[PDB]
Design brief:
Chain B: This is Spike protein S1. This is part of a larger assembly, with chains A and B. Chain A is about 50% helix and about 0% strand. By secondary structure, chain A is mainly alpha-helical. Chain A has one domain. The radius of gyration of chain A is 25 Å and the shape is globular. Chain A starts with a helix and ends in a 15-residue tail after the last helix. The chains are: A mainly alpha, B mainly beta.
Chain lengths: ~600, ~200
């Protein structure tokens, strides 16, 4: 009969059996987290084995159905996640060799060879809060001469294996496969191929470049009082003076730089003790945030199936901020909720992932999840950003409604968020572009460390403290590279964090910056956000973006409105400090 | 009337005939269609709906003038660890007429590969299973729906139940309605007993 009619029957049969197998793998993982036992580890492996075997079995029979004969512009998006092959498309002997490289980069990164102590939070707190030039430099050089030296033969074979695997699925290289998630493959009219992702990203970096120059020059000028000999006003910042092994997280450098000493950063910990909270009480206060905005309420079985309190040290249990999704209406959360401000900001960041899956609960399993990677994290960042605004917390439970800040307080708030949100923005764009040249062939095999430091001074602005040879290796020690994860998911998270906040605050009769917008007591911002959160994998992200913001690509303009008081203050404080930097100065 | 104010049913709705009017009305014969479904399928049990449940399992007539009894449950039809004892038909070669049962088992045919005793490609198993688990949400909870059908034929109805009784007062010129006779007079004690069937 009809080819498109029989294709829906094959997908309904898969969804009626995949939800039962996926729920078993998620239920077995919760048993190990509740009680640390060796029996729960085997149950999780046996549950995941049948999931990988049933998915691979149905993927073989799905290749017989034609993909180009889809005219409904909906079934094609459901066959892409089913007909996937992954790293098992090559030979059987090369499958175990490629997976072994991922374990070698993770074993060395997990173990500590510096004496003993680990990297995080062990060595991370050493090269940040010590205030010395010869102390934090020896720890950074010892890590590259032990960890980076044992990754040269492993990283060379990682490029040749990922290149052959990518060409088997009709592509180009490893970097081209990551760009295919943003390609529109469903509804036509909004053309956005993989080649379009090369642009736009490079255009927004030029407009945000003057903003990054005022932030990097402020941190460089602060350390001149402690290092008057090495650090020069016309120089830069070495790799060991960034508070991180690679310079990604710059939050550790906030303890050394102080913008104003009259007003300290805001803290809502004192308001939690006055209202007598029991840790669980935080989950009750976080529920009213989603009800008064327009989003649906929670479920009845969420307060009895998910962990809400702390089990203590007497019970073997683990906890880490995470978004668990068991499926079939079952949702659980595993976070050691305490009584402080750190656990209150991370509560709303991970609660948005639970409300995301509840939007498309009635939709089939194939239509769940977004069409592009990194879009789920943008839903959680817009919720945690509003949880720290003093103008928003005055209309709910914690805090006093008669609480406001001045201009001296906003400086300390915008500077702290600039070392985490937009602090890792140039670092993501640097590695995303550098890997596209190594996988293709624009960089020789013996020029990986030479070209690495050349792109730092042109994008991030970090000089080379120790000239590396052809034996060291920096990108292989990354948590995303060692686990076969794409680093591009954090780039779109920063841009989409301010675009979604600008759209929800625009309909609520509010313009200008986004450090004082109100989210609660507004049923219009929640109804507009719920539109694209129900679509999922049924429609591409280009069409779903117009339902909230009103564009098809990223835009750095909403990002500049949030840091408007910070960009103006950093202009007058860095105009005596050589705004920017020069690539002529060298530390060695 | 005693089954409406009990406050023990989650959904007690009717169609056409009001719940406060069928208490003193005769009925030729009343059926009893009992079945256990999910939570989202309760809205589909209505005269004039369609989908994958009302057109393949229980079909309601267009002139249905009865009631739909449904209550919440999770212990009388769902055990610990998941209950997969209630099956249902998802796809079939044809629809089902109202008031008709089907206990056969056949393989659905999608496009080519005629399906008759052979499964695999282009042939799927329609008889699935509900996911009645106590750890799921609210929409996945089982609901034991009992649909009652009302019909009227030319045969004399044996189920009516007209009205309740009152007190007895004599030596007064009040109104009384014994059986179908309405009379107004003084009721006095009589010693002339009639026949034991008049």
């Amino acid at each position: 009969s009809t080819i498109e009619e029989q294709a829906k029957t094959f997908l309904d049969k898969f969804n009626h059996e995949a939800e039962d197998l996926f729920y078993q793998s998620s239920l077995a993982s919760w048993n190990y987290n509740t009680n640390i036992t060796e029996e729960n580890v085997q149950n999780m492996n046996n549950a995941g084995d049948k999931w990988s075997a049933f998915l691979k079995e149905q993927s073989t029979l799905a290749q017989m159905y034609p993909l180009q004969e889809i005219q409904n512009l909906t079934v094609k998006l459901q066959l892409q996640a089913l007909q996937q092959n992954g790293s098992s498309v090559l030979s059987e002997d090369k499958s175990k060799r490629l997976n072994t490289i991922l374990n070698t980069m993770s074993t060395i990164y997990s173990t500590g060879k510096v004496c003993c102590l680990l990297l995080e939070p062990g060595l991370n707190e050493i090269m940040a809060n010590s205030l010395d030039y010869n102390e934090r430099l020896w720890a950074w050089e010892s890590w590259r001469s032990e960890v980076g030296k044992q990754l040269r033969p492993l990283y060379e074979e990682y490029v040749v294996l990922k290149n052959e695997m990518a060409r088997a699925n009709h592509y180009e290289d490893y970097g081209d496969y990551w760009r295919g998630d943003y390609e529109v493959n469903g509804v036509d009219g909004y053309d956005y191929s993989r080649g379009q992702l090369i642009e736009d990203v490079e255009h927004t970096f030029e407009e945000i470049k003057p903003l990054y120059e005022h932030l990097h020059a402020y941190v460089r000028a602060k350390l001149m009082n402690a290092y008057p000999s090495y650090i020069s006003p016309i120089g830069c910042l070495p790799a060991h003076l960034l508070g991180d092994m690679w310079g990604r997280f710059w939050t550790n450098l906030y303890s050394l730089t102080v913008p104003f000493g009259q007003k300290p950063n805001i803290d809502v910990t004192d308001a939690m003790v006055d209202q007598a909270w029991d840790a669980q009480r935080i989950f009750k206060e976080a529920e009213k945030f989603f009800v008064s905005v327009g989003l649906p309420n929670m479920t009845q079985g969420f307060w009895e199936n998910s962990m809400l309190t702390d089990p203590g040290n007497v019970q073997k249990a683990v906890c880490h901020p995470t978004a668990w999704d068991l499926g079939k209406g079952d949702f659980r959360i595993l976070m050691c909720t305490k009584v402080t401000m750190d656990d209150f900001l991370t509560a709303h960041h991970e609660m948005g992932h639970i409300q995301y899956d509840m939007a498309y609960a009635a939709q089939p399993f194939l239509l769940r999840n977004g069409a592009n990677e990194g879009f789920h994290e943008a839903v959680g960042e817009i919720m945690s950003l509003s949880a720290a605004t003093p103008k928003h917390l005055k209309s709910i439970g914690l805090l006093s409604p008669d609480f406001q800040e001045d201009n001296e307080t906003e400086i300390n708030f915008l500077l702290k968020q600039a070392l985490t949100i937009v602090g890792t923005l140039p670092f993501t764009y640097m590695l995303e572009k550098w890997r596209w040249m190594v996988f293709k062939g624009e960089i020789p095999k013996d020029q990986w460390m030479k070209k690495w430091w050349e792109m730092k001074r042109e994008i991030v602005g970090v000089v080379e403290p120790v000239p590396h040879d052809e034996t060291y290796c920096d990108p292989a020690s990354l948590f995303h590279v060692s686990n076969d994860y794409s680093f591009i998911r954090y780039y779109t998270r920063t841009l989409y964090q301010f675009q979604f906040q600008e759209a929800l605050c625009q309909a609520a009769k509010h313009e200008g910056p986004l450090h004082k917008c109100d989210i609660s007591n507004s049923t219009e911002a929640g109804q507009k956000l719920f539109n694209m959160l129900r679509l999922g994998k049924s429609e591409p992200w280009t069409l779903a973006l117009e339902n909230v913001v009103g564009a098809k690509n990223m835009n750095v303009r909403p990002l500049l409105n949030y840091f408007e008081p910070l960009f103006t203050w950093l202009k007058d404080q860095n105009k005596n400090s050589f705004v920017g930097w020069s690539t002529d100065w060298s530390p060695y | 009337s005693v089954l409406y104010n009990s406050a023990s049913f989650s959904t007690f709705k009717c169609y056409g005939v009001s719940p406060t009017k069928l208490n003193d009305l005769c009925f030729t014969n009343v059926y009893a269609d009992s079945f256990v479904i999910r939570g989202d399928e309760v809205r589909q049990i209505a005269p004039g709906q369609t989908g994958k449940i009302a057109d393949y399992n229980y079909k309601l007539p267009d002139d249905f003038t009865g009631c739909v009894i449904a209550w919440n449950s999770n212990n009388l039809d769902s055990k610990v660890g998941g209950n997969y004892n209630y099956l249902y038909r998802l796809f079939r070669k044809s629809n089902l007429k109202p008031f008709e049962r089907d206990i056969s088992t056949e393989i659905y045919q999608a496009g080519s590969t005629p399906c008759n005793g052979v499964e695999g490609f282009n042939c799927y198993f329609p008889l699935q299973s509900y996911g009645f688990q106590p750890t799921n949400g609210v929409g996945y909870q089982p609901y034991r729906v009992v649909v009652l059908s009302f019909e009227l034929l030319h045969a004399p109805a044996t189920v009516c139940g007209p009205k309740k009784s009152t007190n007895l007062v004599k030596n007064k010129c009040v109104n009384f309605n014994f059986n179908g006779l309405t009379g107004t007079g003084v009721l006095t004690e009589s010693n002339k007993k009639f026949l034991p069937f008049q």
